[PDB]
Symmetry: D2
Subunit: 114 residues, 4 copies
Amino acid sequence: CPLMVKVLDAVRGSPAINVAVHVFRKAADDTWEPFASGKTSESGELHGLTTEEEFVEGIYKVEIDTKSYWKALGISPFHEHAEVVFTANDSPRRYTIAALLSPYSYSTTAVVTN
Amino acid sequence: CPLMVKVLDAVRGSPAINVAVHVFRKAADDTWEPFASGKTSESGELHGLTTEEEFVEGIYKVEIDTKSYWKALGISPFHEHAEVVFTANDSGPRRYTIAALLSPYSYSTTAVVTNP
Amino acid sequence: CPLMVKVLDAVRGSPAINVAVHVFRKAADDTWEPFASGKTSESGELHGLTTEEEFVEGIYKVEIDTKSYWKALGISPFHEHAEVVFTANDSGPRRYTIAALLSPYSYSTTAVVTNP
Amino acid sequence: CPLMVKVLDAVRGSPAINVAVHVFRKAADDTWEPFASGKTSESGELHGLTTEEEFVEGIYKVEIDTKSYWKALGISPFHEHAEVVFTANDSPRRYTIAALLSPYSYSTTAVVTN
Ligand SMILES: O=C(O)Cc1ccccc1Nc1c(Cl)cccc1Cl
Ligand SMILES: O=C(O)Cc1ccccc1Nc1c(Cl)cccc1Cl
């Protein structure tokens, strides 16, 4: 599993469950190409987005549909989503994209390991 | 000032100086139209991006050029740039402060929204 | 102003107002001696805690009373209070801004350190 | 495992390895009593600090020795440590205390689950 997403709720102190995540790859013409997607599990985790064979070097965008998440909890959010844009690089790389969510704030970190 | 950006450096314990910022607005046709751009000052702040008249209701994207910043300092960062996307002024004019705290492999961003 | 505190609310997208702050200094005998205290204003800022003369070299603890804050608003938070412990002024006098961003189950804190 | 600590490095984008963690319980006389301790593993994780039988309701402090961590990497840190003070409460509770570290900044979150 080369690319994993982890999403947490800073208001309830829990995994953020059933959050839609869309991954895009940057094409040669600079448009964003749909690459992979899913919903976070009960652990707030999203696995099996892609394989090592497909996950070539390039610029990727991970879009976390945070607005819909806060809406379903009855809370008015600030952001449309959270966007994590980065270059995948063969020179470590099991990528964990973690995001902590608040109504008016989010943080994201990359955990890159062998 | 209706839209302002503040950036801090979590490695140096300092304002993030000379950080390029590009602001876009979602157009009728769903494309990101260039709206405003600037660079953070010595205080890590960016003011005078727009006016109260030009800053109408819409979906805005604030792109903080974090990679260029860390690179300009001999650090190879994870992110290309931090992207803050939000609907602004949908219940009348508000004033927005987009705050960001930067580490090479992490950032957090928060919004301060006040009613003038 | 050599020591200042700024607090934001990540739930409301606002300054955290009326947040109690207690500052302690490590004494010769290793105990935490009361140093200064105050409350954040409408801007979420706390100034005038100490002077440049009183703020000598030492290990300081800034206690931001986050539980009291969230409780005063009908939210049951995780943390009792955020604790920022640091050595100050060990290479001559500096000015410190302790910044904190609060969520019910999370906070981040950063330091802005400037040479006057 | 009622209490788990996870520590990450925001500069290198990795688990923070070999970080000393000390847990204290608040005594009736308001002093901090040594409760449990350890070093974070290669995954930046610390498990088996305590058991359900011992982890009774009360105020606990998790002290993360961040200064020593940054020193060993040759980096001058701001904080003496990171302190996470909280009440353990029987009314969820598998507690994960997560901390993300930078030289002049840290964030911490509680992930509390059933
Ligand atoms: O991911 C973030 O940036 C938010 C954050 C803040 C404080 C402590 C931990 C985390 N994230 C986090 C968590 Cl809560 C668990 C596993 C891995 C990570 Cl990166
Ligand atoms: O800016 C953010 O979103 C994160 C953050 C984390 C910890 C401490 C401060 C901040 N932000 C922040 C900033 Cl960038 C300026 C003034 C006051 C604050 Cl609280």
